[PDB]
Design a protein around this nucleic acid. Structure first.
Ligand SMILES: [Zn+2]
Ligand SMILES: [Zn+2]
Lengths: 120, 120
RNA sequence: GACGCUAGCGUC
RNA sequence: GACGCUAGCGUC
């Protein structure tokens, strides 16, 4: 069932599992312009290249006074997208409100939709 | 089902699960004189007391050119005993030869006989 | 980011 | 030892 991700630090809404996409069964990104508003970016202090994408920026919660580290932003194929680490969020079940703290995506089981270039 | 612990680094036989005893359902020690031949000690650089015992020393694989860290030696009640961390070892099934690498005792499921002072 | 590794610190 | 938290390094 649908879930939302909240910033672990300030509990601000980040996105919904419906917006989440999986790349190479290993990396997690989020679609839509709404999410772009929820984080700010910063040139990565240790940028580098690996696999199918290059690491350009660190990303953080947009909430001033929070600035919680949410992960990175990368160039993947012809796209520049955010890649997030679940450890930076609280997962909340929308129907019940039950909150879950994961450390690894491997432990978080949901409909893991694979990334599709045709979604932009 | 009885199994043997091998030094993770040099693969030397250390003990059997038969010899293992649990203290406070959290800490693991080894009975018998045979095990006493398999490790050497060195005063603990960062001693301290906690729970029911006192940390006196570190213990290492007695094999020279190995000396893999196996855990500690403590005064517990009126006992001087070794306390081992499972991640310093490789578990081997005696019947099949299958080897398992655990990191935490909670993950290792064997007949965990609790410590009995009546056994020295 | 995913994973692996070293060092240090902290609690019982 | 059982947990917990930092920092750095490496790999793709
Ligand atoms: Zn936040
Ligand atoms: Zn050894």
């Amino acid at each position: 069932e649908n879930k939302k991700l909240l910033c672990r630090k300030c509990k601000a809404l980040a996105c919904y599992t419906a917006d989440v996409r999986v790349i190479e069964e290993c990396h997690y990104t989020v679609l839509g312009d709404a999410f772009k508003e929820c984080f700010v970016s910063r040139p990565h202090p240790k940028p580098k290249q690996f696999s199918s994408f290059e690491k350009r920026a660190k990303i953080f919660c947009a909430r001033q006074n929070c600035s919680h580290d949410w992960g990175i932003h990368v160039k993947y194929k012809t796209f520049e997208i955010p890649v997030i680490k679940i450890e930076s969020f609280v997962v909340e079940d929308i129907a019940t409100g039950v909150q879950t703290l994961y450390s690894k995506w491997k432990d978080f089981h949901f409909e893991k939709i694979p990334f599709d270039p045709a979604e932009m």
